[PDB]
C-alpha cells in the first residue's frame, strides 16, 4: 500500500536568516494525521562547500517505532500558491529514526534571493513537501 501526505512550511523573515554554511533550521513535526513523526530541515547557506551556492533541503524521520521506505517531493510555492521548482526522489529511500534524505542542491541561492523572481513575497519562503510512505 501507500500513504500519501504533505506539509507546507513557511519560513518567515527568510532574508534575515543568519545560518552560515552547515547550519540548519528544522520545521515543526508533521505526520499523515500516525505513529510516525517527520520534519523538514533546510541549510539556507548549503550543507557544505560543494553546495554553498544552494539551499539544501531534507526530509527527516524524527520518530518511528526499524525502518520505512518513502518517496518524497519538495517544491516552492509562489505568491499564487502554485508549486514551482519541484524535485522528486526517483525512488523510495530507506529511513530509520533520525535519518534524513533530500537534495543538497535544491535551489540556487542567487535565484531564490533575487527579488525579481518573486519567490519571497513578504520575505517569506514557502516550501511544500509531499511524502509517500510504502507500507
Amino acid at each position: 500500500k501507500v500513504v500519501k501526505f504533505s506539509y507546507m512550511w513557511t519560513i518567515n523573515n527568510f532574508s534575515f536568516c543568519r545560518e552560515e554554511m552547515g547550519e540548519v533550521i528544522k520545521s515543526s513535526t508533521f505526520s499523515s494525521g500516525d505513529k510516525l513523526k517527520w520534519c523538514l530541515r533546510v541549510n539556507p547557506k548549503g550543507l557544505d562547500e560543494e553546495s554553498k551556492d544552494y539551499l539544501s533541503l531534507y526530509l527527516l524521520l524524527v520518530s518511528c517505532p526499524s525502518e520505512v521506505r518513502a518517496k518524497f517531493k519538495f517544491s516552492i510555492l509562489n505568491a499564487k500558491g502554485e508549486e514551482t521548482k519541484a524535485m522528486e526522489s526517483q525512488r523510495a529511500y530507506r529511513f530509520v529514526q533520525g535519518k534524513d534524505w533530500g537534495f543538497k542542491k535544491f535551489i540556487r541561492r542567487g535565484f531564490l534571493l533575487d527579488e525579481a523572481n518573486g519567490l519571497l513575497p513578504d520575505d517569506k519562503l514557502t516550501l511544500f513537501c509531499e511524502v509517500s510512505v510504502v507500507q
Binding site: 530541515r41 531534507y58 526522489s89 534524513d100 534524505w101 533530500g102 537534495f103 543538497k104
Partner: peptide
C-alpha cells in the same frame, strides 16, 4: 535529481 543525506 541527486538524493543524499546530511545525517
Amino acid at each position: 535529481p541527486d538524493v543524499s543525506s546530511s545525517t
